[PDB]
TrEMBL record, chain A:
The chain holds residues 244 to 289 of 1298 of the full protein. It comes from the Eukaryota. Belongs to the CFAP91 family. Residues 29-46 form a coiled coil. This is Cilia- and flagella-associated protein 91. It is found in: Cytoplasm, Cytoskeleton, Cilium axoneme.
TrEMBL record, chain B:
This is Flagellar-associated protein 59. Signal peptide: none annotated. The chain holds residues 634 to 682 of 925 of the full protein. It comes from Chlamydomonas reinhardtii. Transmembrane segments: none annotated. It comes from the Eukaryota.
Automatic annotation (TrEMBL), chain C:
Signal peptide: none annotated. This is Flagellar-associated protein 172. The chain holds residues 604 to 653 of 904 of the full protein. It comes from the Eukaryota. Residues 14-50 form a coiled coil.
Length: 46, 38, 50, 426, 426
């Protein structure tokens, strides 16, 4: 329906929120990966 | 390290079950369209 | 004759030591590979949880 | 449907497990030959939790013996009820750990662990629904402490959602039989606190005191100590094999008892224990069972619970009984001894009932406490460990075999914070 | 009604056949003398596949026996079930093999095979409907490797349509019991690949490992190895001799197991193999049979199948069985490890069932796999051949008996291209 085409754009904006969540998780996970590399390096050195 | 990996995998499985049960509880998003139309 | 036998036995002991050393090197290489791939798996697990 | 696989480590574990099977086979009604000859059907109705049918009424236990000597296995087979075991489970080396943790955890442990995991995998695959494993071992030897620790760690790296009941016969000083007990006990508890999920503390000192005082025995050999331990081990887990008014299985017990993610060290009792002269002059009422059950000279631990508070407690009664009577008994106990119970946990005690008592005894009960007095045994072993380790006595037997000095100090620190958490919460 | 003809050559072939006829005769119920004294009437119905009634019930097995010395026919006649073989079926020479493929396949071949083709053709006319030929021989000898191979050439030249099972044992590094194995292995495999239809490859180290690990035997010997090979050879033809839920004829086996005409070197194994010590502990159930099948420790050939890729496989089952459980097992094992099977074939595993298990059991199977990890078997012999032939070692025994080094080079080339084909299909 014509109104559904507004609802589908609501869904599109929800997908945009999903992309924002994806980006936030990407940043946090990259930082965590770096931390894991740091801990493993220190362990190997010791 | 394998211990930590297994713990994380179990946590992922728990979150999987949580999501699926929340889906089953709620539905049993396609309702808002007809709700507004009414 | 004794020196001939001695040299032979010493050479045998040598090749034995390199045999066991090669075994240990292979095991340690296996372990390092397992450790790094386990780190890859833990990263993938974090992604799945996210 | 639920499954338990039982593993025996070392000579102590092998003997305790042999007596345990001698007891539980009778409690299920099957003779040593392996052919059922009992009376009722409530036995056979859920024996699948331990046994496997082989060929037309030949039931084989789900147990794995393992050590580093053939002599212990020969003794186990020569003893009664040893026929039932599957010969495939009999895994052993020939050299012997020799009370050496390095042998039991690094050389012989490494050379046997791959083989033993094959058979444990076979048993854990032949089943349908696992709920946890049982391990019987000591903390003062090589084949029992180090090898059992390696085995349980290898299990945890494979079944990360299961419990283990690790029955650890703690090395008591006044009943010590080897010169280096602490160098094994500390290094075993290091990983027991990390991997095993229900460590049941036992000690030959408390067992001998129980036999001398209550049983009034004259010549108590290891037979009766193993008998008591087997009775406890068979009573803890009847909530599966038998139907009760209030049923409580292993996970329920674990979640009820363990309040914090690392305080799993249980001190255990059993009732009723009587001499065969005073068993004619006593009344087995529920209040009497409860009073004996909380009698401090009955817990199988050298640490008197009067020296600390109770984090929590659990009781498992067997025999047709009154649930209200049980609950009011435990309430009276808690109200009378409220000073021994943690203040930030209301109703520190759990109760369960099974409608079948161990045969002969028309009524029985078992006690599992999580009291903070457990720190006594650990400080009493840490004192000896520090006293020896100050001058590196007997240390070359491990350093030359592959352990640095820093590992012992890290084990010291882990033992210290383990014994400090109980003090903190007390 | 579908006739099978058995051909025995070489000392190993004669012994293996004298045990195979032992098993078949005892399971169809004919006593040593030669009459019929079975119990059930279901065995009588298909005895024509392996036996001929002469007069008065003195059944004669339908076999051809060939060699170059009478010292093997003496043993064949002496051994149990020796009197059954028809005396016309003892074509023997007078010189001897000598372990030279030249004497096996060129010199003595002319004056022996021309004489034994008369017997084999008379047997073919005596039987009515030949389903095919089964020949049990050797590859490391002089009679089986050379004279047997030339007989294979002549038989295939005569009858093109009939299938051929070639039960052939091959040499091995650890159990190399002679010093010219590579020559008589290459010079036999070159014709075997072109000329046969199903190469049942066996060895001696695999059989010894089976008799040591699975059968737990103390002093395994040729009697036991030949007994295992006999069990497999009877299991392969169980279907023609007994009805069942899903029959499986020899052509059906070939069709379901061969994706390319020259890729037909299978590897076989038996199930169940249990020790007499622990007979009464295991469970004769389809999951246990399939678990015992799918593993390297049971295959009757020196191949590590997990170091390759099962192109196809087939599983014969015997006993009152459920095809539902059978094929769910065959599918679960297939889907657990998709890497060890080939990508471009769905349903790599064929299954078949018969309703009569072998005597002395109740439930059996037989696994025949067309793998690509069998290339290393021939790779070992190829590298031995290269090393030995680069310096013309022992070559004069061949090049002084009407043979040219071109033959050696071409045989090596054929082995190389075959092993290349296996390696490519990975
Ligand atoms: N309950 C019981 N304990 C035992 C028995 N035999 C030895 N122990 C105890 O177990 C400890 C020795 O552990 P052990 O089995 O030898 O470990 P291992 O040295 O690695 O083989 C000693 O402190 C004994 O007190 C027995 O038959 N029954
Ligand atoms: N597995 C097994 N192998 C055998 C048996 N008898 C002989 N062999 C081996 O198979 C090969 C057969 O070749 P060979 O006996 O020399 O043939 P022939 O002497 O020309 O008749 C021999 O080299 C033996 O090592 C047996 O009963 N079982």
């Amino acid at each position: 329906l014509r109104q559904r085409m507004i609802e589908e754009w609501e869904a599109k904006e929800w997908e945009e929120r999903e992309q924002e969540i994806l980006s936030i998780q990407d940043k946090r996970l990259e930082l965590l990966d770096n931390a894991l590399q740091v801990r493993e390096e220190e362990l190997d050195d010791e | 390290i394998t211990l930590e990996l297994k713990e994380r995998l179990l946590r992922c499985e728990k979150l999987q079950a949580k999501f699926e049960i929340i889906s089953a509880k709620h539905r049993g998003a396609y309702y808002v369209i007809k709700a507004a139309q009414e | 004759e004794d020196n001939f036998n001695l040299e032979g036995r010493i050479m045998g002991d040598l090749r034995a030591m390199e045999e066991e050393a090669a075994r240990l090197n292979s095991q340690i290489e296996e372990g390092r590979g397992a450790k790094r791939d386990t780190l890859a798996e833990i990263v993938e697990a974090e992604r799945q949880i996210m | 449907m639920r499954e338990i696989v039982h593993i025996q480590g070392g000579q102590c574990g092998n003997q305790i497990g042999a007596k345990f099977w001698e007891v539980v086979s009778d409690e299920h009604g099957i003779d040593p030959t392996g052919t059922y000859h009992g009376d009722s059907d409530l036995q056979l109705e859920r024996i699948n939790v331990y046994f496997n049918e082989a060929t037309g009424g030949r039931y084989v236990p789900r147990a794995i013996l393992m050590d580093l000597e053939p002599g212990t296995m020969d003794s186990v087979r020569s003893g009664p009820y040893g026929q039932i075991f599957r010969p495939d489970n009999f895994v052993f080396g020939q050299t012997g750990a020799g009370n050496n943790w390095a042998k039991g955890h690094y050389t012989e442990g490494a050379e046997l662990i791959d083989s033993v995991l094959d058979v444990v995998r076979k048993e854990a695959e032949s089943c349908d629904c696992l709920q946890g494993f049982q391990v019987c071992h000591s903390l003062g030897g090589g084949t029992g402490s180090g090898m059992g620790t390696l085995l349980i760690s290898k299990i945890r790296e494979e079944y990360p959602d299961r419990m283990m009941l690790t029955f650890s016969v703690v090395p008591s000083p006044k009943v010590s039989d080897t010169v280096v007990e602490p160098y094994n006990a500390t290094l075993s508890v290091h990983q027991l606190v990390e991997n095993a999920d229900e460590c049941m503390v036992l000690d030959n000192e408390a067992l001998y005191d129980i036999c001398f005082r209550t049983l009034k025995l004259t010549t108590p050999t290891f037979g009766d100590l193993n008998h008591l331990i087997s009775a406890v081990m068979s009573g803890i887990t009847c909530c599966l094999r038998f139907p009760g008014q209030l049923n409580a299985d292993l996970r329920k017990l674990a979640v009820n008892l363990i309040p914090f993610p690392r305080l799993h060290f249980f001190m255990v009792g059993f009732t009723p224990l009587t001499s065969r002269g005073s068993q004619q002059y006593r009344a087995l009422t529920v209040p009497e069972l409860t009073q004996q059950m909380w009698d401090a000279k009955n817990m199988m631990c050298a640490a008197d619970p009067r020296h600390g508070r109770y984090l929590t407690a659990s009781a498992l009664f067997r025999g047709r009984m009154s649930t209200k009577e049980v609950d009011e008994q435990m309430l009276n106990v808690q109200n009378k001894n409220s000073s021994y119970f943690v203040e930030w946990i209301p109703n520190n005690v759990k109760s369960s009932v099974c409608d079948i008592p161990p045969k002969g005894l028309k009524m029985s009960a078992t006690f599992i406490g999580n009291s903070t007095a457990i720190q006594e045994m650990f400080k009493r072993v840490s004192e000896q460990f520090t006293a020896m380790f100050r001058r590196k006595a007997f240390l070359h037997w491990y350093t030359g075999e592959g352990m640095d000095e820093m590992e012992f100090t890290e084990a010291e620190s882990n033992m210290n914070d383990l014994v400090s958490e109980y003090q903190q919460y007390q």
